[PDB]
Structures are given as structure tokens and as C-alpha cells.
Design a protein around this ligand. Structure first.
Ligand SMILES: Cc1cn([C@H]2C[C@H](O)[C@@H](COP(=O)(O)OP(=O)(O)O[C@H]3O[C@H](C)[C@H](O)[C@H](N)[C@H]3O)O2)c(=O)[nH]c1=O
Ligand SMILES: Cc1cn([C@H]2C[C@H](O)[C@@H](COP(=O)(O)OP(=O)(O)O[C@H]3O[C@H](C)[C@H](O)[C@H](N)[C@H]3O)O2)c(=O)[nH]c1=O
Ligand SMILES: Cc1cn([C@H]2C[C@H](O)[C@@H](COP(=O)(O)OP(=O)(O)O[C@H]3O[C@H](C)[C@H](O)[C@H](N)[C@H]3O)O2)c(=O)[nH]c1=O
Ligand SMILES: Cc1cn([C@H]2C[C@H](O)[C@@H](COP(=O)(O)OP(=O)(O)O[C@H]3O[C@H](C)[C@H](O)[C@H](N)[C@H]3O)O2)c(=O)[nH]c1=O
Ligand SMILES: Nc1nc(=O)c2c([nH]1)NC[C@@H](CNc1ccc(C(=O)N[C@@H](CCC(=O)O)C(=O)O)cc1)N2C=O
Ligand SMILES: Nc1nc(=O)c2c([nH]1)NC[C@@H](CNc1ccc(C(=O)N[C@@H](CCC(=O)O)C(=O)O)cc1)N2C=O
Ligand SMILES: [Cl-]
Ligand SMILES: [Cl-]
Ligand SMILES: [K+]
Ligand SMILES: [K+]
Ligand code: NA
Ligand code: NA
Ligand code: NA
Ligand code: NA
Ligand code: NA
Ligand code: NA
Lengths: 397, 397
């Protein structure tokens, strides 16, 4: 068989990796999205990956003429018409529990509409928008403080899994379909949200305002901004101003308080930059007071730097352990795949203090992971001839 | 006690009637809505009613200065501020299951949002929009072909009941409250729907388009109009045009067929006028073919004339019985309260054929009802000196 993987991001990358590890005899090809210019971001560039792993990249046009192929769209950006192929072995992963939420912005809309869950759906491509028969789908609940970013990461992940579970069946042809019901079918278009002129409607209830805030929270693209302040989460108060919804009751460095249709809301200014800086050398105590929401402890900057990555690079041992106690991953990575252990090794090197490593190993620090270049911490130390640190790190299980 | 009834429509009228029948010693006052100019429509004018029943009509301003009073808002149109009263005995009926759907157009929005149910809520007035503590509420399911009109009539009815059930408790002061949750609180404003420039979004799924159609179906105000055709219901087909959503696939006297995001839809032109005319003298068979949806058999024109009222006035006996077999009320009334029996008596008079009456009585025709003027069929025949018909009608139980 030939297998054509058209799309982008960690879903296209991780499915392709699994195929490589698991299916030989398959002849792989890649079609990439138009805005994929080779740059890794909060997601990997699938184009860069394919070039490095020698997966031939072809045009959508070339894809039409391949016979004895399977075509699989993973967040692909161009319309695929099944009449342009000799076969009907054409599949898509859609980021919703179809028939609901066909179309665009499916990381926002379920939140805006205050859904209790969402899902991912594997289905056949037909001529229209997310309309072809369903092969498989899985659902999952939305968290109370779900954001568009957290939702999107759940899609990437569940999408990847649902594809890998179904791949053998698509390749063999031994899978079932069910036509999508008309009932409960919904669709949003490109025009349904203007991200370049985002307005929060403040003539709304506290809950509705917060749902809009959280729907529009996706740091790599934007934070919601109100009265010139970037907002990162908030809360519903018990007070109820008599003033008109939208009235600013309080504005300072820390927060905005607004009158709504029902209960006043408190909206936290974003202090993520201040948090990262604090993680360099302040105590867990200092950080717990600086933060307004514990969600900020799992945020990452444009490089993929999280609080734990800062604490590790600066050898701030108390903050590392505290963050872990709040459910932060001790083996967190930046966007190049560089791990906590890699950062903490740098601190060991620069400082000459090796005494903290044991603690971290005990907390589950993994020395054997590899970055996106396929190198471990050991490959780095060998390469840079840091042999005494290599050997000290090598004693640990 | 004094009891001030502020509002409009059959809810304000029927609550006031119950008070009159059931509570003496209460001193009643009325405050009316600004657009209530004394005219009965698909709802009674509360102003006309109060004038005829000698309920003194006062200004909202006068209402503030009444001591030892209770104030009850039933679809009232001006904002009520509890700080303007000596007491806090101030209640409202809202047409939703609060905390959801505060604000406007609550006969549309639950339909647009494809809710499975709605309700009515009795609560205290506080300073804001539909935000005060809840005294009582009842919920009910939305029908699959619910329209804004059918929904609205359910509100009028359930509202009326919930008020009558609770009145003694409000008068005594022996009732409980519960503060409205923030969670699941929603609000729509005046601006959320422009009824003077209504657009149906056709770049949507079949189901979404039909939900918008039905949400905007309220004959006294408007029918949805697409491509210059008034629409009265429709259906989802099994075909799926490849053409773009909104493409008109077929247009004739009977219907529009449109391409959507998923399944084609068939939208019925309104033929209500043609149906009423048919009921004058055509068969049940003829009418069953003329209609495109059985919903059209329960529609009424600006006078309150329904199909059964036409068949009765014209003595079309087969159509009367058939309509009854489809669940039409044999004691239907127009908007002046004039009943089927009143219309059928006219036919008896004009034609001299008395032979059908027995059948109708057997089907449950009620000769003892009174119109809005408080007259029965017998009061009319006495008045007009139609004594042989009076006496023939009088033999029936
Ligand atoms: C463009 C943009 C997106 N978002 C959020 C909401 C989106 O659901 C999420 C993903 O962005 P996105 O550009 O991938 O667009 P989406 O609209 O999510 O996905 C569509 O486009 C993809 C290329 C696929 O064809 C997919 N099948 C489509 O549904 O990020 C922002 O918060 N701000 C933004 O400015
Ligand atoms: C996290 C952090 C990093 N840095 C430095 C370290 C890097 O030299 C530079 C870019 O960071 P980065 O996350 O993009 O680094 P990467 O290129 O992913 O990883 C390199 O740097 C690590 C420290 C390890 O040595 C690893 N073996 C290297 O491949 O910024 C800071 O100065 N302050 C910081 O707080
Ligand atoms: C004005 C209008 C209303 N409608 C429908 C939807 C509405 O829910 C329903 C009732 O009309 P409406 O003018 O009573 O306005 P609503 O918006 O339903 O009710 C508000 O105004 C009332 C006076 C009360 O203050 C009530 N508490 C408010 O919620 O009729 C139309 O279909 N076309 C229309 O043009
Ligand atoms: C239903 C119907 C009524 N009419 C006439 C009868 C009335 O004279 C006029 C207005 O109708 P309407 O529903 O407003 O009448 P109403 O004023 O409600 O009722 C009067 O007319 C009835 C027939 C009874 O005599 C009753 N006792 C009267 O009070 O239209 C028709 O010509 N064709 C019809 O199909
Ligand atoms: N047949 C098919 N259906 C899909 O839903 C789909 C594919 N193919 N392929 C990948 C991706 C592409 N999705 C899209 C969706 C809409 C437009 C589009 O042109 N959208 C405009 C209308 C026209 C315009 O932009 O000029 C819009 O308003 O949304 C382009 C690509 N997609 C599934 O993910
Ligand atoms: N305190 C109180 N709350 C209510 O929700 C309420 C009452 N009173 N009294 C009766 C009725 C009146 N409702 C309303 C609601 C809004 C406006 C209003 O002015 N609305 C505009 C904003 C201002 C404007 O029109 O200039 C809007 O955008 O909706 C007037 C009367 N109503 C419950 O039924
Ligand atoms: Cl090194
Ligand atoms: Cl008479
Ligand atoms: K307020
Ligand atoms: K279509
Ligand atoms: Na299947
Ligand atoms: Na947009
Ligand atoms: Na060295
Ligand atoms: Na109560
Ligand atoms: Na409006
Ligand atoms: Na006479």
C-alpha cells in the first residue's frame, strides 16, 4: 500500500512516527499545509519532520494520481474532493464529536456554548464539510476552566490515539461506517469568530463572560484583552453591583472587576512573565502569592519554557518540588523536546552542585528521554566532553 | 391587602379573573404596558379588561406610593426598582427556567439553541434583569416542531397556573426563596434578534436552518421569508446536493428546496389562506392533500379564525369531524371568545338544517361556554328572538 498523510502539527507527526515504527512495506508520502513554512512552534512543523525523516513531500495534485493508496487528512487545510481519486480510501480526523461542531474553531465553540463534553471523530471524506460517514469517535468531558488551548491539546492527543487504534483496519479495509445523523448536526464557519477583532460581550451574565474569556484563551494566538489589560482567567464574585453590565468597578495592576447582568466578575491580569522570572530564584511561598490562578503554573512561553523549566535551568530546587506537588510534569519539555533533566544538567554543569539530582530522580526525573534531534542528556555530555558529570549522572537508575 | 397587577395579555387577565373569583377583601389595581392601546389580538388587552371590570388603572408612579400592597409583574414592560417601594413584596413571572434565559425573546432562543426543555419562574424583583431569588418554577419539554408561537402559548398557560398556585403564599408571606445560581445563567438582549430585518443563516446544517425557521414562526408577528416566499414548516430530505449551502435546488408554488452544509431541506410555502377557504366546502380528503404539514390545521388568522371555526360557520360537517380526529379542539374560540358552537348555530340559523348538531354534541361540543362579553349561544338566540332554534338546541345535554 501507499499511505498519504496530509496535514500538520503533532497529530500528523506522531501518527507518522507510529507508522514508521510499526508498519514497514508501507510507502509513505506527505502533503503539507500552506502555512507550514518549516517552523516548530507550540506544535512541530510536519514539513520539517518529513524532510528530516526522508518522507517524500508531494502536492495535493500529485496525491490525486497515486493508485493503490490510502489518503489520511490530519488537520489538513485544503478541500478534498473524493471524485478526484480512483478509490474511496479517504479519511479525516475532525476535532469534534460529529455530527455536532462541523467546521471551524472547535476549540472555542463548545466552550462558548457551555458544553459538558466534546470529542474527536474519524470519518470518510465526502464532498462536503465534515459530513462523511463515521468510522470511529471518542468523547471526553470539558473541565470547568477548560480553555481553547487546553481543549486543543486534548484533541491533538485523542486524535492521535484514535488514528493509531484504527489504522490497521483502514489499511486492511476491515472497518464499519455509519452515516451521520441530521439531528444535533451543527456547523460554524470562518466568519463565526473574528480573531483579529475579538470582542467580549459584557452585556451578559458572569458565567457567559467567563466562558467567552476561557474560549478565547490560547496564549500562542492571543489572550482576551479588556480595557487594555490581557486577562488570564478569573472568578465570579458574590457581590452584585447595581451599575450597568460592563461597568468597571475596580482596575489595578492585578485585576479588573466588572459589573455584569447578575454577579460581579473578577478578571485576573496576565502575569505570566512575572511568574517565569520568579521561578529563577524565589520561594514556593513567594510564587503562591504572586499567582492569581494555579493554571498559570502550566503555561509556556513562545519557546516552550514553563515554570518548571525555568526552576530547573536555575537549579531552584524548592520550586521544582513544589510545582511537581501541584501536578506539573517533572519531565516537561520545551518545543524542541528539550527536557527538565537537560535544563537541570546545565545548572549542575554551570554551578558544580550535583547534590539535588537524587531528589529529582526519586520524584521521577527521566534521564533517558530524547529531544527532537534524537539526543539524550548523555549524548550532550559526551559531545561536550563533560565526562565527570556524565559519570555522576550515570550511577542513577 | 392591596394587590397591584402590572402587565399584559392573557396571563394578566386570567390571574386577575382568578383573584376576582377567589379573593374578596383584596383591593385590586392595574398598571398596563405602554403598547397596550385597548385592542384584543391573539391575546386580550388587559387595559380593556380592567376598564370593563372596573379595576382601577394606575401609573407605575402611583404604584410606588401604595402602602400595604403586593406588586405582581406579568409580562410588564418597565423596569421596577425595589428601592422605590416601602416594602419588598414585589414579584415577577419570567418566561424561562431561571437562571437560564434571562432577558428577551425567550420563545425564540431556547429553540435557536435546540434546548430539550424550558419553563416558567416566579421570583422576586430585584434591581437587575430577571435576577431576583426564585419562589417557584416549573419545566416542560419542547416539542420537535415547537415554534415560537406554540412555546409562547405554553408560557402564558404555565405562567398563569404557577401564579395561581402561589398567590395565597405571596399574600400570606408564607413562601420560601432561593438565590439564583451563577452557573448556567444566560441572558439575551433586545439587540440579540432583529425582528425587523430577520435573516436565516443558510450556511448551516439542515437541522440548524429548521430550528431558525421554527424559532421565527409566530404568525401574528411574522413568518420566515426566504427568496420572497413565506415559509410554514419544512423537513430534512435524504439527498445531499454537492452545491453550496443556500443554493436553491427547486422553487415552485408549493415549496423551496435548498442545499445545506449536510442534508437538503424542503421548506413549505405558507398556504394557510388556501386551507381556510377550502374548509368552507371541500372534503377532508381535499384538505389532507392541500396541507403540507398538519401544523397548519391549528393555525388562526388575525381574527382568531381556525380551520374548525371556518368549517363550523359553513356547516362543513365532514371537515369538522375530521379536524377533531386530528386533535383539534371542538370548542375552539376566536380572539373575542366566540366558540365553535356559536359559529355552527349561525349555520343552523341561515340554512335551517339542524340535523348535524347531535353529532357534534356527541363529540363534546359545549353549548354553555361564554364569549368575552359573557354571553352564551342562548343569550344570543334569546336576544335575536330565534326561539325555535333556542328550544331545539336546549333539548341536548
Ligand atoms: C486562528 C486562531 C485559532 N484559535 C484557536 C481556535 C481553534 O480551534 C484552534 C486551532 O486553530 P486552527 O487555525 O488550527 O483552526 P481551526 O478552525 O481549529 O481548524 C480548522 O482549520 C484547520 C487547518 C483544519 O482544517 C481543521 N479541520 C479546521 O477545523 O486555535 C485561536 O485561539 N486564535 C486564533 O487566531
Ligand atoms: C530555560 C532557560 C534557557 N536559557 C538559555 C539556554 C539555551 O542556551 C537558550 C535557549 O533555550 P532553549 O530552551 O531553546 O534550549 P534548547 O535549544 O532546546 O536546548 C539546549 O539548551 C539546553 C539548556 C541544553 O543544553 C540542551 N542540551 C541544548 O540542546 O536559553 C536561559 O538563558 N534561561 C532559561 O531560563
Ligand atoms: C417582537 C416580536 C416577538 N416575537 C416573539 C418572541 C417573543 O419571545 C414573543 C413575545 O413577544 P414580546 O414583545 O412579549 O417580547 P419578549 O422579548 O418575549 O418579552 C420581553 O418583553 C415583555 C414585555 C416582557 O417584559 C418580558 N418579560 C420580556 O422578556 O414573540 C416575534 O416572533 N416577532 C416579533 O417581532
Ligand atoms: C368564521 C366566519 C365568520 N364570518 C362572519 C361572521 C361575523 O359576522 C363576522 C366576524 O366574525 P367574528 O369571528 O369576528 O364574529 P364575532 O364578533 O366574534 O361573533 C359574532 O358572530 C358569530 C357568528 C356569532 O353570531 C356570535 N354570537 C357573534 O357575537 O364574520 C364570515 O363571514 N365567514 C366566516 O368564515
Ligand atoms: N471535503 C473536505 N471537507 C472538509 O471539511 C475538509 C477537507 N475536505 N479537507 C481538509 C479540510 C479543509 N477545510 C476547508 C474548509 C473550508 C474552506 C473554505 O474555503 N471555507 C470558507 C468558504 C470559502 C472560502 O474561504 O473562500 C468558509 O467560510 O468557511 C477551505 C478548506 N477539511 C476538514 O478539516
Ligand atoms: N428590575 C426589573 N427587572 C426586569 O427584568 C424587569 C422589570 N424590572 N420590570 C418588567 C420587565 C421590564 N424589562 C425591561 C428590560 C430592559 C429594558 C431596557 O431598557 N432594555 C435595553 C437596554 C436599555 C434601553 O433599551 O435603552 C436592552 O438592551 O435590552 C426595559 C425594560 N422586567 C422583566 O420582565
Ligand atoms: Cl553538556
Ligand atoms: Cl341568534
Ligand atoms: K450588575
Ligand atoms: K450541500
Ligand atoms: Na466503524
Ligand atoms: Na474568522
Ligand atoms: Na568539556
Ligand atoms: Na419557594
Ligand atoms: Na430586536
Ligand atoms: Na328573529
Amino acid at each position: 500500500m501507499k499511505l498519504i498523510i496530509a496535514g500538520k502539527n503533532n497529530i500528523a507527526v506522531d501518527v507518522t512516527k507510529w507508522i514508521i515504527k510499526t508498519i514497514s512495506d508501507i510507502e509513505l508520502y506527505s502533503v503539507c499545509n500552506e502555512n507550514d513554512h518549516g517552523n516548530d512552534s507550540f506544535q512541530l512543523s510536519f514539513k520539517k519532520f518529513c524532510i528530516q525523516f526522508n518522507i517524500p513531500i508531494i502536492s495535493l495534485e500529485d496525491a490525486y494520481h497515486l493508485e493503490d493508496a490510502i489518503f489520511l487528512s490530519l488537520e489538513f487545510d485544503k478541500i478534498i474532493h473524493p471524485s478526484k481519486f480512483t478509490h474511496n480510501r479517504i479519511f479525516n480526523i475532525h476535532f469534534s464529536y460529529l455530527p455536532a461542531y462541523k467546521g471551524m474553531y472547535t476549540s472555542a465553540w463548545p466552550i462558548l456554548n457551555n458544553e459538558q463534553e466534546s470529542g474527536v471523530t474519524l470519518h470518510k471524506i465526502d464532498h462536503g464539510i465534515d459530513t462523511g460517514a463515521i468510522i470511529d469517535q471518542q468523547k471526553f468531558p470539558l473541565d470547568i476552566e477548560e480553555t481553547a488551548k487546553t481543549l486543543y491539546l486534548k484533541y491533538i492527543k485523542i486524535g492521535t490515539e484514535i488514528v493509531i487504534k484504527n489504522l490497521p483496519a483502514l489499511i486492511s479495509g476491515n472497518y464499519s461506517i455509519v452515516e451521520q445523523s441530521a439531528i444535533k448536526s451543527s456547523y460554524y464557519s470562518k466568519k463565526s469568530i473574528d480573531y483579529k477583532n475579538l470582542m467580549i460581550d459584557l452585556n451578559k451574565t458572569a458565567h457567559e463572560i467567563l466562558q467567552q474569556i476561557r474560549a478565547f484563551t490560547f496564549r500562542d494566538y492571543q489572550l482576551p484583552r479588556i480595557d487594555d489589560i490581557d486577562i488570564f482567567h478569573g472568578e465570579i464574585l458574590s457581590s452584585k453591583s447595581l451599575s450597568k453590565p460592563g461597568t468597571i468597578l475596580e482596575k489595578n495592576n492585578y485585576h479588573l472587576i466588572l459589573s455584569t447582568i447578575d454577579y460581579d466578575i473578577k478578571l485576573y491580569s496576565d502575569n505570566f512573565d512575572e511568574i517565569l522570572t520568579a521561578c529563577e530564584d524565589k520561594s514556593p511561598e513567594f510564587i503562591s502569592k504572586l499567582l492569581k490562578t494555579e493554571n498559570i503554573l502550566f503555561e509556556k512561553n513562545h519557546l516552550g519554557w514553563s515554570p518548571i523549566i525555568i526552576a530547573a535551568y536555575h537549579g531552584n530546587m524548592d520550586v521544582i518540588e513544589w510545582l511537581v506537588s501541584k501536578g506539573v510534569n517533572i519531565n516537561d519539555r520545551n518545543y524542541k523536546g528539550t527536557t527538565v533533566a537537560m535544563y537541570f544538567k546545565d545548572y549542575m554543569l554551570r554551578s558544580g552542585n550535583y547534590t539535588g539530582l537524587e531528589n529529582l530522580i526519586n520524584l521521577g526525573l527521566d534521564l533517558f528521554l530524547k529531544d527532537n534531534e534524537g539526543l539524550s542528556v548523555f549524548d550532550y555530555m559526551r559531545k561536550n566532553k563533560n565526562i565527570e558529570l556524565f559519570n555522576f549522572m550515570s550511577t542513577f537508575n
